[PDB]
């Protein structure tokens, strides 16, 4: 099972996942990037079934940029998260449904940072804080317990390690390296990857 | 003048001008002769050249082990003929594994060709047809035309000045039937030489010949193999 | 068929589509509709052809519809062909928000039915619409907008444009007395009436001959409203005043 | 069918064929239309070619729904398309909203229809000109549906042979103040104007509109007001 | 009578606001020659129609204008006799469709309406002409009593007293005019009477044919040789 | 101009095309049936336009069906094409009934088919006239004829191509009523030698077939030596 | 079942003169609680709202459908939907998917645009109608809401009074449910206000 | 559906509708292109410049993705629907290459999409002519040009639209490696070939430059305004 | 006015007809076909001086066996182009081999005729269709009617028939590819309006054992001195 995790600050979001590809018993990739660059403010992190991930992600990311060169400025996160939402419900009741979780994190210019879970049947809700996978019943009451709303974006990586460090001590599962990025007013940051 | 633009206009007179109009278009294309025997059909067509570089155009074209053909008038539209012949018979012999009977096959032309002559947009195939086949019944020679109509002929020639060959070919049918294969194919030869102006003749690259029999399958035979029909022509 | 066939579609010896040329004839006598952009809002002023004493009062309007909660448009022309239009709008508006959940930008509002309409002019052998429609609205990228769209499936943005009969006079008016963004929606309403005062031929402006709606921002929502008689007498007043 | 329009700009800037259609509007029978206080009356002049014609076997007046009534002026077998569409537009409408059409939707479904036939593939525009009523919401409507597809409200019309002098008559005796039984005699009296010879409760139709619903007028009561 | 463009070739308006195509096949159905009489009864409705047969080798059986649309409705054409025999198709058709979807016998002026409808499709579109003829039908209605329909080219229809079709229709409707403004044998004899009077003509009974619908017995019938004999004996 | 399509009426109700479609029959060679008391015979002039053709091409007489005999006249692939729609409804009326088609009906269902032509302008009517003819115990002999407006009649004998009057005067002198398929095939034939025209169309072969008490409900080609007595005794009357 | 997949309970009471409708804010998948603040509640018109419980995909599409189909009627019709209208609306919305239906069961709540009647009507997932004259309610705690219903409402009851009795009706229907909660938002429709309040509730 | 063929063979050899649509390109606003070192010069004349209009809205220059822009000439509304058709296309090639189209890819697209409509039934050829440039993968200069046959070339410099002839003409003679040298002196040789036909020139003419890795980097009043004082 | 399925009184479909006119129109392209391949040369009428001359193409590869001139309508080429390509590819991935330049002739002339009212009208352009398979060095023409022949020499384009003249007297049987080359680039300096350089005209061979070759620059300069 594959790990997402995004905590939105007051003026960023902090994004991570975990880098590895399984192929049944053994990782063929173990610096795998699950995130996607929809535009300059907005980042998709997918997860889930083998293929379908990076079809819609590719479809998303190509649609949100078809808009940005047809009027000449970028779809909001808001509208992004329900364009993505309408697309995978779409596809919900048909022959070819899409089973992939998702985060959608993203800046906007007047509504500042935004951070949207979506499950695998279109269900789409703001929040906080949010995890995908296996993992977010290990980390979820972690950060239930630590975040404030006021909190900055260094605390907010040390709250991202206390979640990571859990996951090497309690996941059954070998995830030793993570993919960090943070979107903010100055657009999308590489952070340092967190490896164990 | 109002009345020759449309397939679909009747003229006054009871006649249809985009049909006589596609019949043109067979009279200008080089001759063709077809002929046949007791035991064998015959099909001779001058090989025309556009250029004194270029190959001569072909004319006879094999349908079918037992069917064999000759075309006139417009290349496209043979093609889409003889193409549309040809899965008729692969038809009949995936579904009944035997070969199609010959007035079958010219049945299913003539319908096939006389839709587009009550269709509005639609044009006539303006080729003609000379169809040499062999079954139960015997060889055939069969003709067809852009209107729609078929026959059934002892011999025949269309084309370009074959109204010649035609006369030359109704003088000399009456010994067509007890007539061997090789005699009968020179029968063919000289009907067609008629068609030419005075000067040419008939040579190995403008004569091509195709047969087909009681005890052979159809056979088309070009530039060299044509030679011993040729040879010991007077 | 091809006997009869019209032939709406094509082009013409010197490059010319006559079907666009003589929709945009018919136009060009209907009633006068004038749009002005101010620095609080937008306005729509159009004269009313349905004038009769008999005539029944019970809709909204006459030209002006709305499209969306912060669009409005007027129309000049074919009065059904308009109907056909505007309905159209409104559905693409909606399926926009169904997709987004968030109104459509009023510049791609326009672009949509512009692309209608120059399918019309190049395939299907249908005669075009016969209309010319201004659009006012408010959105979140470039607040208040004026847009004018045409038969042949062009539009443009204006700060101030006319369309309709005598909109040529109506512009030539407009380029000497609007100042570009020193305009209010009081002083863009005085202006409206000076122009559609000199456009119109029948002395007295009058009440009852035309129809005016207004766009604004009021506590953070789009309000559009059709002026009423009361307030468009008073406004008649006041360039006699004037 | 031919895919290509009938109708067609003019170099003017005309569609013609949309004005042929109103001259054979024109030409038809006269028709009135007056709103009354609490109701709304529909008048035509049905003058038979005959003695032969049953009188009984034909209408002019049609429902379309419970408060809906119509009628036209022009080609009687293009009004009887439009009556037959504007009963299944009235009960599309039901069905998806369990509620009785409102006039004004119902006259502007109509007229969608109409405006179809002056731009769609192979076709004419109708020949009739319509003039419906309806009561919703304690209020009674009067509308007018051309050939063009275009649509008003009226308070009092007239359409047909001389409609142009049953309009000025219209206005010199219509007052807002009218009752139903005072709208329906001067309807009559304005079909009186362009009559022919002597009006009976046979060569007319009266169709009035009410809280109660729509209905024609039965020869009995007509008969009466005549 | 103003023209423009192919106002005169396809069923467009003209600039009178007329159809000229659909006036053209009103002439289309004078062009057999032929006149028809339906006339209403008190408790029965009669059609009687000419019956020409001048050819000899023709098999007279088979030379008819009346048919039967369904057991109890009858009706007479006039016109172009392709273009009946299609409508008498389609109406046969209409009655029967109705029968199995609504569970009873279609009314006569509902079956006219049905065919009155589909020929005004052929006035409003102009890839296909009008039919150059004419239907009269009969028949019993449970509550009205017998009926009398007709319906034209133009998609027009109407119920009739009495009423007439052909190239002698107007001299008909003028007769019966008089006439109208009656028993089964009163109502025939006034059918025939109308034929023969404008057609100048005194009637041998196979030179006319006739159909008869009544209250007692609804069924459509068409009337034999010597039945209608008895009728010409009576009225000379 | 006001004949350039079907589904246009003239100034005076008349559709010129279908009207220039019947040209096209009147230019054909005769073709008759004559309907007697045991069956139906039909009878050919089919001319021969060239010595190089085969006895037996072209021919103008076909089988519909068991008991259904064809005769046509005109433009001979139109007439294909409708003896094919009419062996097609035959077939189709058997399939669905159970039972041979009766030949009224038959006659009808094609005569409407033919009418379909006679509408638009996006097709044109068919160029030719053609006859049924039938036999059956239950319904006895019967004979229709269609032509290209699509009207079809029960003819007692009927007569179709460039003589037809001619030929119409012919067999009005002959009792078919109480005659018998035998003696009514040399008759026939004795009719169509003498329509035949010598200075124009020279040379012709005469086509036989007929349906009746004689073939047990068969429709079939004139058995040879009965149509060699036809034929000589044709020659002998003219 | 599905209709148990995200929880959720939504219930509607009428007054005298005024309507109330009330939801759990709990967004969760299964067991495992994802938000607190998701909204079941959506605005309809001035004095008209829809509620809507069952699978939250299928919340949010109906709400948007319908969105979509009240902003056309309202630009067409030019005039405010009756909550009667709107009840036959949402019911041929639903009875569209007949074979295929969207996992919601709504709650219609609010006074009619000129007489300020109060509606309340409930449909199922084909939809099928339930106009009722004291309370309607839908969810995963559905036999609690009756019984809570059944026992408190009361005829007549004025906006301070009703808004207490639809609040404990929630309150205690909602804790003997596992899969709802997490907060209660309420919503009283009164002639001349709307009053939206949030309850202290159970977080567990 | 009408499929009724609009592109015909006229008895010369011409397709008349083809010859109509180059009519309409005719007059159409000019637009010049020019090559040059390391960045694209695109010149388009403005014409209507009213006081009342937002200029922003009517703008010739486009972007088709983020490494090629266009100009055109001719139908406007054409014009338009035939930008939006490119977009897509762009799209599509990032999503199934996963790399950015060259220019020449991209004019091939368009001008097979041109040739599409001369050959079609029920529809009349795209009324417009364009002028395309940008800089490929490694990053050399491109001009092509598209017309409403469907036929592209590639040129060192070219115009399009009213008067093309005359500043075609005069491109000749003033198009060298000098005058293309910096990228200040490749905005020299534009203005001047525009300055042949364009009213008023100065205001009446909109400007636009591709650079390497670098977006549609439109011009302003004062900074053409520089340019236009020092001529 | 006619439909583009029109019959003239002569026989001939007017729009084939005039279509043919338009081939008239165009460059003229030379095919020859000798013992050691086949060369085609095509003159590539630069109208200005600002245009790049790499830009047209009016030679160009079906297949590694089969090269391709085109002239007339060159936009309407591109379309048959690409179907000749897709047609020895689906060729190849069937039968596990290369499809002859006959058949490839053949299936490209089938598109001709498929037009009414989809094509809504026939190609403007004509054919060369130069290659090896198992026969040899093979010349192939095809026109606008569908028709389509083998040739030993061929010109066509604006002006084909001086160019055949000069072509059938310098043609003969034993005729060496170099020999053709250099005749086939005489004949088309004596046709061409401008003068014959190395960058106005194209120029490719296809020998056995050897690819589709477009002669470069250089390669031009050497055989055009």
């Not at chain 3, 369309?163 to 000497?176: D, E």
């Not at chain 9, 391709?68 to 060159?74: T, Y």
């Amino acid at each position: 099972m594959e790990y997402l995790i995004g905590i939105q600050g007051p003026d960023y979001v902090l994004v991570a996942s975990d880098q590895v590809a399984a192929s049944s018993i053994v990782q063929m990739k173990d610096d795998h990037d699950k995130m996607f660059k929809m535009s300059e403010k907005i980042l998709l992190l997918c997860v889930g079934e083998a293929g379908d991930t990076v079809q819609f992600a590719e479809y998303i990311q190509k649609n949100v940029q078809l808009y940005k060169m047809r009027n000449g400025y970028e779809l909001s996160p808001t509208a992004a998260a329900n364009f993505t939402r309408r697309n995978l419900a779409d596809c919900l009741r048909s022959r070819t449904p899409y089973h992939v979780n998702l985060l959608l994190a993203g800046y906007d210019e007047h509504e500042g940072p935004a951070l949207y879970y979506m499950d695998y049947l279109a269900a789409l809700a703001k929040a906080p804080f949010a995890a995908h996978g296996y993992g977010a019943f290990l980390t979820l009451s972690i950060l239930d317990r630590y975040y404030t709303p006021t909190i900055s974006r260094e605390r907010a990586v040390e709250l991202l390690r206390k979640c990571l460090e859990e996951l090497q001590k309690r996941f059954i599962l070998n995830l030793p390296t993570f993919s960090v990025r943070i979107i903010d007013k100055n657009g999308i940051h590489d952070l340092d990857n967190i490896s164990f | 003048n109002q009345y020759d633009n449309d397939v679909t206009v009747w003229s006054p007179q009871g006649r249809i001008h985009q049909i006589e109009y596609a019949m043109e278009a067979v009279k200008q294309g080089s001759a063709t002769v077809g002929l046949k025997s007791k035991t064998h059909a015959v099909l001779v067509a001058l090989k025309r050249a556009q250029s004194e570089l270029a190959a001569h155009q072909k004319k006879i074209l094999h349908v079918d082990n037992h069917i064999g053909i000759s075309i006139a008038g417009l290349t496209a539209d043979a093609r889409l003929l003889c193409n549309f012949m040809r899965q008729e018979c692969l038809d009949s012999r995936f579904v009944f594994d035997r070969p199609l009977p010959v007035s079958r096959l010219v049945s299913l032309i003539g319908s096939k060709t006389q839709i587009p002559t009550q269709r509005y947009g639609r044009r006539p195939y303006g080729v003609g047809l000379l169809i040499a086949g062999y079954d139960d019944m015997g060889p055939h020679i069969f003709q067809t035309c852009p209107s729609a109509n078929y026959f059934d002929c002892r011999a025949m020639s269309i084309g370009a000045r074959s109204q010649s060959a035609r006369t030359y070919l109704e003088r000399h049918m009456s010994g067509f039937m007890e007539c061997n294969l090789n005699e009968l194919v020179k029968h063919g030869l000289r009907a067609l030489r008629e068609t030419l102006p005075a000067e040419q003749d008939l040579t190995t690259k403008n004569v091509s010949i195709g047969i087909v029999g009681k005890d052979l399958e159809f056979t088309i035979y070009d530039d060299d193999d044509v030679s011993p029909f040729l040879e010991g022509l007077e | 068929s091809r006997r009869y066939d019209s032939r709406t579609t094509i082009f013409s010896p010197e490059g010319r589509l006559y079907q666009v040329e003589y929709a945009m004839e018919a136009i060009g006598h209907a009633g006068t509709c004038l749009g002005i952009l101010a620095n609080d809002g937008v306005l729509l002023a159009a004269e009313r052809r349905n004038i009769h004493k008999l005539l029944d009062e019970v809709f909204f309007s006459e030209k002006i519809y709305k499209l969306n909660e912060d669009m409005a448009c007027s129309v000049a022309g074919i009065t059904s062909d308009a109907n056909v239009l505007t309905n159209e709008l409104r559905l693409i508006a909606q399926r926009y928000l169904l997709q987004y959940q968030e109104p459509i930008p009023c510049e791609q509002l326009v672009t949509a039915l512009c692309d209608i309409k120059q399918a019309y002019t190049q395939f299907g052998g249908k005669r075009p619409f016969g209309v010319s429609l201004l659009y006012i609205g408010w959105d979140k990228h470039y607040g208040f907008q004026l847009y004018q769209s045409d038969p042949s499936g062009n539009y443009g943005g204006w700060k101030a444009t006319c369309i309709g009969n005598n909109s040529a006079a109506a512009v030539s008016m407009l380029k000497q007395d609007y100042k570009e963004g020193e305009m209010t929606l009081k002083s863009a309403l005085a202006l409206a009436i000076k122009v559609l005062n000199k456009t119109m031929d029948v002395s007295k402006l009058s009440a009852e001959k035309v129809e005016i709606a207004t766009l604004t921002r009021e506590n953070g929502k789009t309000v559009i409203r059709v002026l009423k008689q009361k307030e468009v007498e008073q406004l008649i007043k006041n360039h006699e005043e004037e | 069918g031919y895919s290509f329009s009938l109708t067609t700009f003019s170099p003017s800037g005309k569609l013609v064929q949309i004005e042929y259609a109103l001259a054979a509007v024109a030409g038809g029978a006269p028709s009135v239309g007056i709103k009354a206080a609490n109701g709304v009356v529909l008048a035509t002049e049905k003058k038979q070619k005959s003695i032969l014609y049953d009188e009984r076997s034909v209408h002019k007046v049609e429902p379309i729904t419970k408060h809906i009534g119509l009628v036209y002026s022009g080609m009687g077998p293009d009004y009887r398309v439009l009556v037959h569409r504007a009963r299944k537009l009235a009960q599309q409408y039901y069905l998806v909203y369990q509620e009785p059409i409102p006039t004004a939707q119902l006259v502007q479904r109509v007229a969608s229809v109409m405006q179809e036939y002056t731009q769609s593939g192979g076709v004419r525009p109708f020949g009739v000109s319509l003039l419906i009523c309806g009561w919703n919401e304690g209020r009674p409507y009067l509308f007018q549906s051309d050939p063009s597809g275009a649509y008003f409200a009226w308070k009092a019309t007239a359409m047909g042979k001389n409609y142009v002098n049953g309009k000025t008559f219209l206005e010199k005796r219509y007052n807002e103040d009218l009752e139903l039984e005072d709208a329906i005699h001067t309807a009559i009296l304005t079909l009186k104007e362009s009559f022919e010879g002597q009006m009976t409760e046979d060569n007319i139709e009266v169709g009035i509109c009410n809280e109660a619903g729509f209905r024609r007028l039965t020869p009995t009561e007509v008969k009466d007001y005549l | 009578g103003s023209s423009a463009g192919f106002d005169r070739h396809i069923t467009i308006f003209s600039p009178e606001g007329r159809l000229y195509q659909v006036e053209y096949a009103f002439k289309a159905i004078n062009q057999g020659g032929l006149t028809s009489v339906a006339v209403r009864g008190k408790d029965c409705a009669v059609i009687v129609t000419q019956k020409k047969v001048p050819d000899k080798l023709l098999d007279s059986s088979t030379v008819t204008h009346l048919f039967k649309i369904t057991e109890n409705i009858g009706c007479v054409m006039t016109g172009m006799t392709a273009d009946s025999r299609s409508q008498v198709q389609r109406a046969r058709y209409e009655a029967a469709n109705w029968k199995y979807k609504y569970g009873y016998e279609i009314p006569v002026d509902m079956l006219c309406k049905r065919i009155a409808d589909i020929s005004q499709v052929y006035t409003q579109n102009a890839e296909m002409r009008p039919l150059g003829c004419c239907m009269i039908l009969i028949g019993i209605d449970e509550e009205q009593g017998p009926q009398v329909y007709k319906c034209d080219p133009a998609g027009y229809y109407c119920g009739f007293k009495a009423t007439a079709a052909g190239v002698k229709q107007t001299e008909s409707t003028s007769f019966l005019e008089k006439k109208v403004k009656w028993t089964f044998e009163q109502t025939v004899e006034t059918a025939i009477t109308c034929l023969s009077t404008v057609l100048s003509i005194d009637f041998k009974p196979s030179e006319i044919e006739v159909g008869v619908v009544t209250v007692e017995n609804p069924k459509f019938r068409i009337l034999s040789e010597a039945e209608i004999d008895a009728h010409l004996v009576a009225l000379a | 101009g006001y004949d350039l399509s079907a589904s246009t009426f003239s100034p005076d109700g008349r559709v010129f095309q279908v009207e220039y479609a019947m040209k096209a029959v009147e230019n054909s060679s005769t073709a008759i049936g004559i309907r007697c008391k045991d069956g139906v015979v039909f009878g050919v002039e089919k001319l021969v336009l060239s010595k190089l053709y085969e006895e037996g091409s072209n021919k103008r007489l076909f089988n519909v069906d068991r008991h259904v005999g064809m005769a046509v006249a005109g433009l001979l692939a139109d007439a294909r094409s409708l003896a094919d729609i009419a062996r097609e409804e035959a077939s189709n009326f058997r399939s669905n009934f159970g039972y041979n088609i009766p030949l009224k009906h038959l006659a009808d269902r094609v005569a409407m088919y033919v009418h379909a032509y006679t509408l638009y302008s996006a097709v044109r009517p068919f160029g030719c006239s053609f006859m049924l003819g039938s036999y059956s115990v239950n319904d006895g002999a019967q004979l229709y004829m269609i032509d290209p407006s699509g009207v079809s009649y029960g003819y007692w004998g009927c007569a179709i191509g460039k003589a037809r009057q001619a030929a119409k005067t012919e067999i009005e002198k002959l009792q078919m009523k109480e005659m018998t398929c035998r003696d009514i095939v040399k008759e026939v034939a004795k009719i169509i030698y003498i329509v035949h025209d010598e200075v124009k169309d020279k040379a012709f072969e005469l086509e036989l077939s007929w349906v009746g008490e004689i073939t047990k409900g068969r429709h079939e080609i004139v058995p040879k030596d009965i149509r060699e007595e036809a034929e000589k005794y044709a020659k002998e009357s003219l | 079942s599905i209709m148990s997949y995200n929880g959720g309970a939504v219930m509607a009471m009428k007054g005298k003169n005024c309507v109330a409708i009330a939801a759990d804010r709990r967004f969760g998948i299964q067991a495992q609680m994802v938000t607190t603040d998701f909204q079941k509640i959506f605005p309809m018109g001035d004095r008209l709202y829809i509620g809507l419980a069952g699978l939250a995909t299928d919340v949010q599409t109906v709400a948007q459908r319908l969105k979509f189909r009240l902003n056309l009627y309202e630009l067409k019709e030019g005039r405010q939907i009756k909550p009667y209208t709107l009840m036959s609306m949402v019911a041929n919305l639903l009875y569209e998917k007949r074979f295929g239906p969207y996992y919601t069961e709504p709650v219609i709540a609010g006074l009619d645009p000129k007489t300020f009647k109060p509606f309340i009507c409930s449909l199922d997932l084909i939809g099928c109608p339930m106009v009722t004259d004291d309370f309607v309610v839908s969810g995963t705690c559905s036999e609690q809401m009756y019984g809570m219903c059944e026992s408190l409402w009361e005829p007549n009851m004025d906006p301070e009074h009703l808004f207490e009795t639809i609040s404990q009706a929630m309150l205690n229907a909602v804790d003997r449910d596992a899969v709802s909660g997490m907060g209660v938002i309420v919503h009283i429709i009164e002639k001349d206000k709307i009053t939206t309040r949030t309850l202290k509730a159970r977080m567990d | 559906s009408y499929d009724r063929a609009i592109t015909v063979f006229s008895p010369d050899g011409h397709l008349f509708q083809v010859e109509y649509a180059q009519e309409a390109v005719k007059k159409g606003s000019t637009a010049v292109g020019v090559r040059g070192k390391d960045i694209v010069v695109l010149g388009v004349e403005k014409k209507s410049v009213a006081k009342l209009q937002d200029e922003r809205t009517v703008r010739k220059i486009c972007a088709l993705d983020d490494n090629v822009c266009m100009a055109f000439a001719g139908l406007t509304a054409d014009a338009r629907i035939v930008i939006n058709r490119a977009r897509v296309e762009c799209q599509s090639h990032r999503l199934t290459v996963e790399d950015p189209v060259t220019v020449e890819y991209i004019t091939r697209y368009i001008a097979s999409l041109k040739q599409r409509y001369t050959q079609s039934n029920g529809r009349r050829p795209f009324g417009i002519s364009a002028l395309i440039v940008g800089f490929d993968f490694d990053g050399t200069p491109r001009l092509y040009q598209t017309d409403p046959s469907g036929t592209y070339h590639a040129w060192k410099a070219n115009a399009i639209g009213r008067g093309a002839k005359s500043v075609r003409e005069f491109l000749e003679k003033n198009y060298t490696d000098e005058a293309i040298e910096t990228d200040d002196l490749t905005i020299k040789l534009v203005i001047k070939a525009l300055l042949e036909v364009v009213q008023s020139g100065g205001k009446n003419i909109e400007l636009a430059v591709m650079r390497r890795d670098q977006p549609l980097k439109i011009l302003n009043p004062e900074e053409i305004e520089k340019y236009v004082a020092e001529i | 006015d006619r439909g583009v399925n029109t019959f003239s009184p002569e026989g001939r479909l007017f729009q084939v007809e005039y279509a043919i006119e338009a081939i008239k129109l165009g460059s003229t392209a030379i095919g020859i076909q000798t013992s050691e391949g086949v060369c085609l040369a095509v003159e590539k009428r630069i109208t200005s001086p600002l245009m790049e001359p790499s830009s047209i193409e009016k030679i160009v590869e079906i297949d590694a066996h089969i090269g391709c001139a085109m002239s007339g309508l060159i936009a309407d080429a591109k379309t048959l182009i690409d179907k000749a390509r897709v047609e020895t590819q689906n060729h190849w991935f069937t039968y596990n081999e290369t499809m002859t330049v006959e058949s490839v002739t053949q299936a490209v002339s089938n598109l001709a005729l498929q037009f009414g009212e989809a094509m809504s009208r026939p190609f403007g352009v004509a054919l060369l269709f130069g290659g090896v398979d198992e026969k040899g060095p093979q010349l192939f023409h095809m026109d606008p009617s569908g028709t389509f022949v083998q040739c030993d020499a061929r010109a066509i384009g604006s002006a084909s028939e001086g160019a055949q003249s000069s072509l059938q007297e310098v043609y003969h049987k034993s005729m060496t590819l170099k020999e053709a080359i250099k005749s086939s680039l005489i004949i088309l300096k004596q046709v061409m309006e401008e003068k014959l350089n190395a960058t106005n005209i194209e120029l490719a061979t296809v020998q056995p054992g050897q690819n589709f070759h477009m002669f470069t620059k250089e390669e031009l300069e050497e055989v055009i001195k």
